[PDB]
Amino acid sequence: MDVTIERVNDFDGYNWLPLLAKSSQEGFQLVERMLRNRREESFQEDGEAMFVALSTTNQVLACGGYMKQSGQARTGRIRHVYVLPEARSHGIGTALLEKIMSEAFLTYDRLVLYSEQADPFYQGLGFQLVSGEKITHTLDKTAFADSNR
Numbered sequence: 001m002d003v004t005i006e007r008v009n010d011f012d013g014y015n016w017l018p019l020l021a022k023s024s025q026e027g028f029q030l031v032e033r034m035l036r037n038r039r040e041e042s043f044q045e046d047g048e049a050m051f052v053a054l055s056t057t058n059q060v061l062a063c064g065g066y067m068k069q070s071g072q073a074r075t076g077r078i079r080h081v082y083v084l085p086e087a088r089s090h091g092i093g094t095a096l097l098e099k100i101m102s103e104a105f106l107t108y109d110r111l112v113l114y115s116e117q118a119d120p121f122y123q124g125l126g127f128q129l130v131s132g133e134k135i136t137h138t139l140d141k142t143a144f145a146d147s148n149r
């Protein structure tokens with residue numbers, strides 16, 4: 001699918017209802033949490049960003065971003081990654097993560113995330129599976145660079 005990945009500078013300029021509905025249906029709170037908490041965690045400051053994938057008809061097909069990982073130094077957390085069920089398996093998640101990773105590694109020396117359901121996806125991107133309470137996957141910049149330089 002042809003999508004464009006855009007930085008969210010104005011949350012109120014997108015129709016989020018489809019993403020909210022589908023994610024809720026599947027039992028996921030991550031889109032709801034992102035949007036409900038957007039005054040406190042706005043993804044607008046230095047060291048953070050939120051992206052959306054837009055279809056050729058400017059419908060939101062996915063979201064995902066990054067911000068500082070609390071309590072860890074030089075570490076960013078990839079957050080709120082979700083692709084609409086009907087838009088999966090067409091390379092959107094990959095394009096979104098590749099954009100996130102490349103930008104976030106300008107600020108952070110390590111990226112971490114928590115995903116119970118998408119281990120194969122994250123390992124395919126180079127993340128290492130870890131046994132943690134707060135994180136499932138991690139990637140060091142040096143590893144990212146080795147796969148880039």
Ligand SMILES: CC(C)(COP(=O)(O)OP(=O)(O)OC[C@H]1O[C@@H](n2cnc3c(N)ncnc32)[C@H](O)[C@@H]1OP(=O)(O)O)[C@@H](O)C(=O)NCCC(=O)NCCS
Pocket residue numbers: 081082083084087088089090091092093094095117118120121124
């Ligand atoms: C995980 C997720 C972000 C991946 O994004 P995507 O746009 O579907 O992924 P891509 O098309 O870029 O494919 C990259 C990898 O993601 C995985 N993937 C593909 N389709 C998937 C899907 N329907 N569900 C979960 N992972 C999927 C595959 O490992 C794929 O690797 P491959 O192309 O070599 O087969 C997205 O599918 C999602 O938000 N999934 C929700 C969780 C989920 O699907 N749970 C399991 C089913 S209920």
